[PDB]
UniProtKB/Swiss-Prot annotation, chains A, B:
Keywords: Cadmium, DNA-binding, Metal-binding, Transcription, Transcription regulation. Cd(2+) binds at H21, E35, H39. It comes from Mycobacterium tuberculosis (strain ATCC 25618 / H37Rv). Changing H21A: Abolishes cadmium and zinc binding. It comes from the Bacteria. Contains an N-terminal winged-helix-turn-helix (wHTH) DNA-binding domain and a C-terminal alpha helix, which is mainly involved in dimerization. Binding of cadmium causes subtle conformational changes in all key metal-binding residues and conserved DNA-binding residues. InterPro entries: Metal_resp_DNA-bind_regulator, Tscrpt_reg_PadR_N, WH-like_DNA-bd_sf, WH_DNA-bd_sf. This is Transcriptional regulator Rv3488. GO terms for molecular function: DNA binding; metal ion binding. May have transcription regulation and metal-detoxifying functions through which it may enhance intracellular survival of mycobacteria. Binds to its own promoter region and to the Rv1999c promoter region. It displays strong affinity for cadmium ions, but can also bind zinc, manganese and nickel. Expression increases the intracellular survival of recombinant M.smegmatis in murine macrophage cell line and increases its tolerance to cadmium ions.
Amino acid sequence: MDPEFMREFQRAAVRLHILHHAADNEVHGAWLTQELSRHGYRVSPGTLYPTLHRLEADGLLVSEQRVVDGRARRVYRATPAGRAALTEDRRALEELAREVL
Amino acid sequence: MDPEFMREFQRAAVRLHILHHAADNEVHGAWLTQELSRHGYRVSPGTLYPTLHRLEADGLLVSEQRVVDGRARRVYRATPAGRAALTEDRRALEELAREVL
Ligand SMILES: [Mn+2]
Ligand SMILES: [Mn+2]
């Protein structure tokens, strides 16, 4: 166990899970919270919405404001740049793991 | 493709490479710099010694001053905790990459 790594790793894991999920389908932030927990990653809003906003700014997520069932909500989906990023990032993890035996 | 990730990733990669090398054998700072370069991670002393010092503080590296061949030098080697950390960390990277395929 190594806490500096695990603390940084947490940020990577969240980030890549968002892109992965937002690639598969359109996602609400509320659901992302629960989905991430289900995968073993503790994220409370205050990290999530920020990183979501950052992800859009970086042009890897695109968002829609949308009124559905009398409810105003924002949905996110992965841009093609986001899809690229996910694969590049996944590969980088693979190369590192193999590099160190 | 994703420079925010790659910026953080670089720090992780360096950290793990040190542990990997310092696990296999005792290492001088100068040699770490060359080995890291060879692996495509440009690290200058202003970065390295801090990382090394932090790694020691986290109890994953141990350093020794010793006089060898009339030349006084400091060596670093991975503690058993460092060896553990490397494995746990490597595995964590593997599980992430696989679970976002
Ligand atoms: Mn899922
Ligand atoms: Mn080497």
